[model samples]
Target: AKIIFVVGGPGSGKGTQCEKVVAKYGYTHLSSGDLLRAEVSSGSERGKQLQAIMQKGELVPLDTVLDMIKDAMIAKADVSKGYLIDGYPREVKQGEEFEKKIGKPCLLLYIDAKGETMVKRLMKRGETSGRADDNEETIKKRLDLYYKATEPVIAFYEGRGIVRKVDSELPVDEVFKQVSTAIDAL
Candidate 1:
């Protein structure tokens, strides 16, 4: 199956562009963050712990995240057509586990945007979503953690020549255009 990973910082428009990809290209969209949030909302013990960790700008355990991802992959209704995964494998260890469990992802699409832009966007999103981790302090912490934790994985993908970096500072349509072109070439 064709597996595409749409990765980015907190407010890099990965979700918006992934929606367009799904609408136009028939790829199933699997959002690990959304799935985790759903689990948190379910009020399970693991969910409660995850909620606490997420609120502190820390990552949930790698095994927990991988379990959720595997479950989603297995439960998807259209696994044969391929899928676009958003917000997953944020650290190198998780990336390795993902490859071991689900095989190598066909493409890794990294959305690049200015830090200021992401902060601004995430602040607005926090207001709308009422997410505790959306505050400026938590957002910055999360961004820093993301960069530190995921940079090695990004470099690994870059070395493999399967990494595509899309500038996410453009208008939504413009970003989508670039993303679409990249996917098409892949």
Candidate 2:
């Protein structure tokens, strides 16, 4: 019944670590960015509408994302060990609203890393990811967003005494070792 928020920058290895964690811990993973991207690509009526909204240079409304997340969470509530909410609550307001509606999270796992590391990893991943957002310009924007927006959300969780900071700049195995230790502590 735990809900853990995975907080990190664009290339802070959040995805890779969460993959390992979900396998080892049996938590159902929900990636906010993946959900949004899927919606835009689904070609369902709603997906078309979502694409239209994006074409207008507007972000999907918070309530829309909240609804989608809530549905996915509820759908997996029974069988999964817990919920790994990855790359969510990118801003403080979103964190506040999600808590109000869906209840407070059990933990906020902060993957600590330097901006330079994040940028380099993103550039390397871009070679294979082919994701436009992985470029330097977008990575810089995302890093800035991570600092300006998600940093406050991290503080929000820290103030609640539920944050566990893990060094993410280490090798993958070392990083996941710490991540495992944190979740296993729960």
Candidate 3:
């Protein structure tokens, strides 16, 4: 299947843009965080294990997460025109492993936004959302993690010549216009 890896900062509207892509391209949108939450809430043995690790402030293993993504992809393969992987491959090694196992992505959508812009957007969202972690300090750390870990993933794909960037600071439709252009050329 055609794979598109979507990468962006915490408030880069990755989810929103992915929704637009699904509407336009008929690709199945599989977000790693969503799958992880689903598994954790499913209350299975593995769910308990994951919950245990998470409760201790440990990250779930990458292989474990990748397996869930693979299962989800297989489950949807019959109907999906393509796959938009919203939040896996957070590191260069992760991307390498994914390509070694599943396949290389046809495109990596780097939803570009300035750090200030993302901070402002997330801070505003926090008022209505009441997410405790949306505090500026936490958001800043998240942005730092994105830069240190995820940005290299984008560069790795860029080296392979499949990276397309959209300035997410633009209006939603405007950003998607560039998104559409990228996918159209695909």
Candidate 4:
């Protein structure tokens, strides 16, 4: 099956664009963060632990996150075609492990946006969404982590000739149009 990974710093509109791609292209959008939140909302043991860590603006263990991702991929209704994966393989090691597990390289869609823009968007989102991790401090940390850990995943994909960089600074519709074009080319 084909797989497309949507990678971006926080507030880069990956989710919004992924929704459009899923609607128009018939790809299932699998968001690791959304799955973790769903688990927490379900009140399971792992969910309880995740709730505390997420509230503290900390990341859950990589294994836990990978497990959740694997479960979601397995349980999805339309895995035979393809998937749009978001918020995963956030580190080089995770990318290696994911590749090992999935048995091949997936298309990597890197969403590019300025850190200042992400900070502004996340600060506003925090006020409306009541998500503790959306504060400026946490958002900055997340962005820093993205550069420190996740940026290498881009290089990893680039070496394999499958990295697609999309300018996420544009309007949502324009950005999504770019993404759609990229996916269509793939």
**TM-score for each predicted model, relative to the true structure:** 0.95, 0.90, 0.88, 0.93
Q: Write the per-residue lDDT of candidate 2 for residues 1-186, one digit (tens) a residue.
A: 789999988789888899999888888989876787788787788877766654442346688788889988988878977888888887888888999999789998899999999888988987887775676676777777678878988888888998999999999989999999999898
Per-residue error (Å), model 4, residue 164:
0.5
- lDDT tens readout by residue for model 4, 106-184: 6888999998899888999999987878877778788887888888888888998888899999999989888988888
Instruction: Give the poorly placed runs of model 3, Cα more than 4 Å off.
Output: 44-60
Q: Model 3 scores what on Cα lDDT?
A: 0.85
Query: Best by TM-score, which number?
Result: 1
Q: Report the lDDT tens digits of candidate 3 across residue range 1-186.
A: 799999888789888999999987899999987797688899899888876654443446889989989999999989987999997788888888888889888889999999899899989987888655576676777778788988888888889998899999999999999999999998
Q: Judging by TM-score, tell me the better candidate of 3 and 4.
A: 4
Off by over 4 Å in 2: 44-60
Query: Candidate 3: RMSD over Cα atoms?
Result: 2.5
Clashing residue pairs, candidate 2?
none
Task: Give the least accurate 10-residue stretch of model 3, judged by summed lDDT.
Answer: 51-60
Instruction: Give residue 82's error in model 2 in angstroms.
Output: 0.4
